[PDB]
Amino acid sequence: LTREAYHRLTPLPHPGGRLFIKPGARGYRDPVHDLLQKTVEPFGERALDLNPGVGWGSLPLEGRMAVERLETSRAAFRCLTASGLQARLALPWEAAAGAYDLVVLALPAGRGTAYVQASLVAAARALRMGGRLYLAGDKNKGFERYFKEARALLGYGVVVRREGPYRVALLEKEKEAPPLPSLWRAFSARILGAEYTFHHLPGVFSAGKVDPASLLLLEALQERLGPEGVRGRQVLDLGAGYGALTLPLARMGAEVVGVEDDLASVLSLQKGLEANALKAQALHSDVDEALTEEARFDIIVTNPPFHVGGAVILDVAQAFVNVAAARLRPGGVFFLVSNPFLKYEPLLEEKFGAFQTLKVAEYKVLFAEKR
């Protein structure tokens, strides 16, 4: 896709209306959300959707109930807003307690057990006594385990729709919700001779340890540019996460801007910067959406997202490369790290004209220079 195509919001028809989608936004052609859309019915007056994506799953409630939506993805919030659907940039556990009659939760299984648990408890806390939860998921991705936990938190629960491995259950709050679990985790790492303490919320990439690919990128970067090669330079970190690249580059004296689509990750980066007495801009952004049109950089770095066991480069990851080429000044440089067999080489050749391979073992570090 072109940059404009990546960032474009496209409305698709459904009976009575339209819904905006875009590349990089969850909840489109997603069987879990599709099953919710076929199943959810109004109950009471106030509903809360804790993982809406583009908003298809809970859409049947719109215009029949008051619906609030809490969403961590900037890309998804762009879509919801374009669709005229009320939505807030918010973590699931930021939901008001005891304020809702109905909650809708497509299980965020891809973000892991702790994130799902925090979402389940947030759902339980959000409901008034006697309120109900629509819980949807995939038996291949923890549905039975998470449904069992929801039943323990809430009370009576029953499957109300099934299609292949996909499930929607309906549950009733019959008991008091517990307190939120502890959400913050910290760990310390020595990177290129300096000590860092990273801080993060549930669901982030590489919780609890610095990703070996990210370390490899930093090693290749310091080898290529020197320990002083980053000082005073403007750096863009595409997909900054909790700051595995951002913090060291800041410490090395770069002027760093991190862009990150996931709110939980943005807050994680902010806490790490503070705890380590480092300054950088930690932006909640769908790729470079938060940047001015004119912003350019001397160095761009990325450990892009990837589909686990996938063989195909993700739309977001392809956009990272396109944006990198467009956002570099003449003579600026790009570092990208990936799994060894992802086909980034032709993409770099197309957007930059040439590329180099700085490292290749467990991961490959690719390099390109803006002409």
Ligand SMILES: C[S@@+](CC[C@H](N)C(=O)[O-])C[C@H]1O[C@@H](n2cnc3c(N)ncnc32)[C@H](O)[C@@H]1O
């Ligand atoms: C492989 S992780 C790397 C995180 C961090 N830079 C590191 O090296 O540990 C890729 C990051 O890209 C982020 N991401 C996914 N889609 C994005 C998008 N549309 N815009 C910006 N960041 C995105 C993810 O949430 C994740 O934090």
